[PDB]
Amino acid sequence: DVPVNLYRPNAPFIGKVISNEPLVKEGGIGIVQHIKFDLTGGNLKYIEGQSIGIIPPGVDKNGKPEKLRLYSIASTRHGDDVDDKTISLCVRQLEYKHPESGETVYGVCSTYLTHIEPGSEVKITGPVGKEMLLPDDPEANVIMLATGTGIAPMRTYLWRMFKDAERAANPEYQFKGFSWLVFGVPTTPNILYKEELEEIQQKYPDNFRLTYAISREQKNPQGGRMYIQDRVAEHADQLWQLIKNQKTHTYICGLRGMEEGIDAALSAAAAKEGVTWSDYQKDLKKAGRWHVETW
Numbered sequence: 511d512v513p514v515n516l517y518r519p520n521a522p523f524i525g526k527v528i529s530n531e532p533l534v535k536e537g538g539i540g541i542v543q544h545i546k547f548d549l550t551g552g553n554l555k556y557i558e559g560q561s562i563g564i565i566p567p568g569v570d571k572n573g574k575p576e577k578l579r580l581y582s583i584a585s586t587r588h589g590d591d592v593d594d595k596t597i598s599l600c601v602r603q604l605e606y607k608h609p610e611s612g613e614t615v616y617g618v619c620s621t622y623l624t625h626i627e628p629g630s631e632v633k634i635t636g637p638v639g640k641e642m643l644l645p646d647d648p649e650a651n652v653i654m655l656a657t658g659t660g661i662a663p664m665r666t667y668l669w670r671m672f673k674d675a676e677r678a679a680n681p682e683y684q685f686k687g688f689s690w691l692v693f694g695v696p697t698t699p700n701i702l703y704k705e706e707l708e709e710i711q712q713k714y715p716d717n718f719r720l721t722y723a724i725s726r727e728q729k730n731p732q733g734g735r736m737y738i739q740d741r742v743a744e745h746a747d748q749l750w751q752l753i754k755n756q757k758t759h760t761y762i763c764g765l766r767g768m769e770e771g772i773d774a775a776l777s778a779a780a781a782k783e784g785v786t787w788s789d790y791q792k793d794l795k796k797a798g799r800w801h802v803e804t805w
């Protein structure tokens with residue numbers, strides 16, 4: 511039984527911030543924070559791949575109360591401390607420039623969150639979502655294609671799969687399949703959770719492969735900046751081969767529009783064996799083995 515909407519916008523759970531730490535190292539672009547909330551006092555439960563809503567304080571330009579913003583859960587069902595008492599988010603502060611203005615605009619909910627102080631009460635809703643769930647089969651293969659904060663659900667899968675404390679807590683899920691994360695960010699300092707991701711690959715070289723697409727530090731064969739679609743094209747045949755397995759699941763998460771280049775690359779690979787990717791993909795989606803969530 512997948513937990514869903516234990517709390518709703520009309521009566522959200524009031525959680526308390528425990529910690530708020532920077533994920534972007536010096537020399538990186540933008541601000542992305544790892545924020546953990548205390549769930550004690552309530553009955554909010556969740557599983558990997560889901561999201562929760564956050565209702566920021568204040569009113570919008572029209573004087574109306576701000577609505578909730580959804581955020582991908584970044585922690586396993588047990589929380590970062592494996593105590594079933596918390597939940598974490600991976601939040602980027604939205605920033606952009608206005609047309610012919612010159613001044614930076616800051617997102618309401620993301621700025622509120624990235625600068626929130628420990629001890630502060632936060633309105634939480636959810637959890638929600640059933641399209642990014644991880645299979646219970648410990649023999650399944652999991653391809654993870656992420657950009658930016660799209661790394662959030664991937665962290666929940668990878669932690670449950672490879673963290674010592676998680677394995678000790680989940681006797682029913684001892685991952686033995688193969689997982690491959692292709693992560694695209696602009697700089698090395700922007701590689702969210704770099705240290706831990708690399709520790710996992712070192713400990714499980716036969717069960718986890720980590721591939722980076724660093725735009726400001728790498729160039730693709732055509733001379734352009736390296737993006738995730740370039741890495742997918744680079745390993746298109748291998749990825750297609752893994753995708754043909756009845757037990758393989760693929761997850762796409764992050765920047766809206768990242769799907770197009772990925773499909774073009776896989777389409778070229780599948781075509782070599784007389785397969786139309788777009789059609790094969792449709793069946794995968796219907797079977798619940800092709801998961802996508804972008805924003």
Ligand SMILES: Cc1cc2nc3c(=O)[nH]c(=O)nc-3n(C[C@H](O)[C@H](O)[C@H](O)COP(=O)(O)OP(=O)(O)OC[C@H]3O[C@@H](n4cnc5c(N)ncnc54)[C@H](O)[C@@H]3O)c2cc1C
Pocket residue numbers: 561579580581582583600601602603604606607616617618619620621659660662803804805
């Ligand atoms: C399922 C789901 C999961 C999500 N997961 C995450 C996550 O894990 N981490 C995360 O950081 N975010 C995530 N998001 C995005 C999140 O919900 C918010 O939309 C985001 O934080 C921005 O909200 P805000 O309140 O800060 O911005 P707002 O104050 O709501 O401003 C947003 C508005 O700014 C304008 N705008 C935005 N960009 C530009 C631009 N480039 N040029 C001109 N105008 C622009 C648009 O009109 C837009 O509607 C997720 C969204 C969904 C739907």
